[PDB]
């Protein structure tokens, strides 16, 4: 049972006026202050698309920008230092991506498209790091489309970008970057990548203290997996994880790729504790106070990085991927 | 909510007489029989040591053999094909292992010590594969001690052995063997190895359909992790996992290495479903009917082996383990 944050009255009033859920929790070290507190407040935003999926793209996108602006203003009242939006936050979701409409109209330059420029202004204005998952057009490489997250500094400068490494059956070509911010080292595991323990691992190995998982996912099976995967990744990697899913029923028609999004955004910690999920249907802001030195408390008990034998696994995996690999199997 | 098995009256009577909990559950494919059923019944045994930790070793061990025999007889009434015992099942547990008493008296030959020979007789008598986690003396290699599990065929023949790959701060030197049995391909993730997603992964890659996790673990933190780790490993690897922990308070004195064991053995499935745990205090037998072709149903939705990019991770991990590795980190 995590301590609830005494979020300001002004924030609660604004969230009520703006019709979104506001929740706040703390993950704090043991009362005895053995080590230094390394406190960062994170914000997770889940929302439905404001306009119908067929609405003009300029209008859909600007309506989403205005919606997020209102929520981030409340996040700032609560002292959020790092905020992350949901997967493909400026568009209706569809299971697939193709090089035709509507995708090609929604797609933007990661470095200087209107959503990134909007986020730079937000970030600077509230002294807040902003993580923006978008559909990217890479104009330097043939206009190919990527599922990309852009990381914006609290100074308003673009820190860089990270791409979706795992795609259900466009696979990310940027490895596992970690962004050093004023408020901690962060990484972004996009959507379906939550299903791959190795994806979480490489971000942690490269130094991530917080791994965000912006997702856009539907159905009974996905919802059953939702409370387990991101939660386990926090434990296994001694880090914090932030699971985000959108809400609402609106979608591009299923004929576009030939859906019900369940929200339930949450934060999980290195000690196995987690926040209650946000609503399954309502727009929402989850504020979490993280002590990033909590891992040091966990590491008095176990250190999985020290006992991981990663050099051994590198060798075993390399052997396993070979085309002539006969598995290590014993028979009578 | 899993279907409970209608275990025979005789089994319930015997379990009552013998003072252990008996539970039975089914993990079945969707009613529509699209594919073939591949049905195996597994048994998980948790127990306390019968005699005080200081009791003579021959007596402690033979009392444990007699206890397990009574439970396995009930397992056979229930149609169990593969049974697994808890970590170091023939001895009191201690956090450490040293090359002195009491450990050196408890330790045995994996190939032909009295516990393995006992298991060969059990296995043959009930047509049951038996997985026996013991403390091994390796006499061919300087009498060094290992945390080892011996896998015995339903014919009574020794199939081979597997060693504990991960040790808290003796690290296993046998890789990730998988045992092909008449009732499926199995592997053993011993104890603390449950904390390492890569350990589970390599067993699955090498072909395991069921990964047993015999453990001996105590404390509030461990119990908090218990429902998450083995459960996630079933999901990530599209397999069944079997989490086993001992019960009782008895232990070697803490001064030996300078404890309360919580049971709660359970089975987790590729669809994220799991059994309710066995008792936190009572001896127990959990029977689970597994359809090993359930993964094929899950793989109509997602196949994580196909989307895992293991060749890419082999390369990234190898680079990461190097002594001169500067992580992939982006700064302003």
Which one from B164, B242, B250, B289 is the annotated catalytic residue? B164
Q: Are A131 and A113 in contact (CB under 8 A)?
A: no
In DSSP notation, A146-194 reads: EEEEEEE-TTS-EEEEEE----------S---EEEETTEEEEE--GGGG
Q: Is B87 one of the catalytic residues? A: yes
Q: Are B180 and A331 in contact (CB under 8 A)?
A: yes
- At what resolution in Å was this solved? 2.1
> What is the distance between the alpha carbons of residues B49 and B79, in angstroms, rounded to a whole number?
26
Residue B177, number of CB atoms within 10 A of its CB: 23
Question: Which method resolved this structure?
Answer: X-ray
| Pick among A236, A271, A323 to test the B interface (most B CBs inside 10 A) | A236
Active-site positions of A read 87, 164, 191
Expressed in angstroms, the distance from the first to the final Cα of chain B is 51
Across A77-107, b (16+ Cβ under 10 Å) vs e yields bbbbbbbbbbbbbbbbbbeebeeeebbeebb
- Region of B155 (left: φ > 0; alpha: ψ -120 to 50; beta: rest) is alpha
Residues of chain B with C-beta less than 8 angstroms from the C-beta of A313: 198, 202, 317
Taking alpha carbons only, the member of A22, A47, A258 closest to residue A133 is: A47
Q: Where are the alpha helices (DSSP H) in A36-85?
A: 57-77
DSSP conformational letter for A221? H
Query: Given an 8 Å threshold on Cβ–Cβ distance, is A160 in contact with B306?
Result: no
> What is the distance between the alpha carbons of residues A317 and A198, in angstroms, rounded to a whole number?
11
**What are A83's two structure tokens?**
């905020």
**What are A287's two structure tokens?**
């504020």
Residues of chain A with C-beta less than 8 angstroms from the C-beta of B179: 329-331
Q: Is B164 one of the catalytic residues? A: yes
Residues of chain B with C-beta less than 8 angstroms from the C-beta of A232: 197, 228-229, 231-232
The sign of the dihedral angle between the CA atoms of B186, B187, B191, B192 is negative
Across the interface, of B155, B235, B316, the residue whose CB is closest to A225 is B235
Which one from B78, B84, B191, B295 is the annotated catalytic residue? B191
Give whole-number Cα distances, A154 to A76, A82, A245, in Å.
12, 8, 24
**What are A132's two structure tokens?**
């923006």
What phi and psi values does residue B149 have, to the nearest 5 degrees?
A: -115, 130
Task: Give residue B199's Cα distance to chain centre.
Answer: 13
**Domains in chain A with CATH codes:** 1-332 (3.60.110.10)
Query: Given an 8 Å threshold on Cβ–Cβ distance, is A272 in contact with B166?
Result: no
């Amino acid at each position: 049972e995590l301590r609830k944050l005494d979020l300001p009255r002004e924030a609660f009033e604004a969230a009520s006026r703006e019709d979104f859920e506001l929740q706040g929790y703390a993950f704090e070290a043991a009362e005895e202050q053995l080590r230094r507190p390394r406190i960062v407040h994170v914000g997770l935003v889940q929302n439905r698309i404001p306009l119908p999926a067929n609405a003009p793209v300029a209008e859909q996108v600007s309506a989403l920008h205005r919606r997020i602006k209102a929520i981030v203003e409340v996040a700032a009242m609560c002292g959020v230092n790092i905020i992350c939006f949901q997967e493909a936050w400026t568009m209706p979701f569809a299971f697939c991506t193709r090089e035709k409409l509507p995708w090609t109209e929604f797609a933007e330059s990661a470095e200087d498209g209107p959503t990134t420029r909007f986020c730079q202004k937000l970030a600077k204005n509230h002294d807040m790091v902003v993580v923006s998952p978008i559909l990217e057009r890479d104009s330097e490489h043939g206009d190919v489309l990527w599922n990309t997250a852009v990381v914006i500094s609290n100074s308003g400068a673009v820190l860089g970008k990270t791409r979706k490494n795992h795609i259900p059956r466009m696979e990310g070509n940027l490895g596992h970057p970690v962004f050093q911010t004023q408020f901690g080292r962060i990484a972004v595991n996009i959507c379906y990548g939550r299903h791959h323990p190795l994806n979480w691992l490489m971000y942690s190995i490269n130094g991530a203290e917080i791994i965000f998982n912006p997702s856009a996912t539907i159905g009974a099976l996905s919802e059953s997996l939702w409370p387990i995967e991101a939660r386990n990744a926090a434990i296994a990697n001694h880090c914090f994880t932030c699971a985000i899913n959108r809400v609402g029923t609106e979608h591009f028609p299923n004929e576009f790729c030939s859906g019900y999004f369940y929200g339930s955004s949450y934060v999980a910690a290195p000690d196995s504790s987690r926040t209650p999920g946000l609503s399954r249907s309502r727009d929402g802001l989850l504020v979490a106070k993280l002590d990033l030195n909590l891992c040091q408390q966990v590491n008095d008990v176990w250190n999985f990085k020290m006992t991981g034998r990663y050099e051994m696994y590198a060798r075993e995996l390399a052997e396993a991927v070979k085309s002539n690999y006969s598995p290590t199997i014993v028979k009578e």
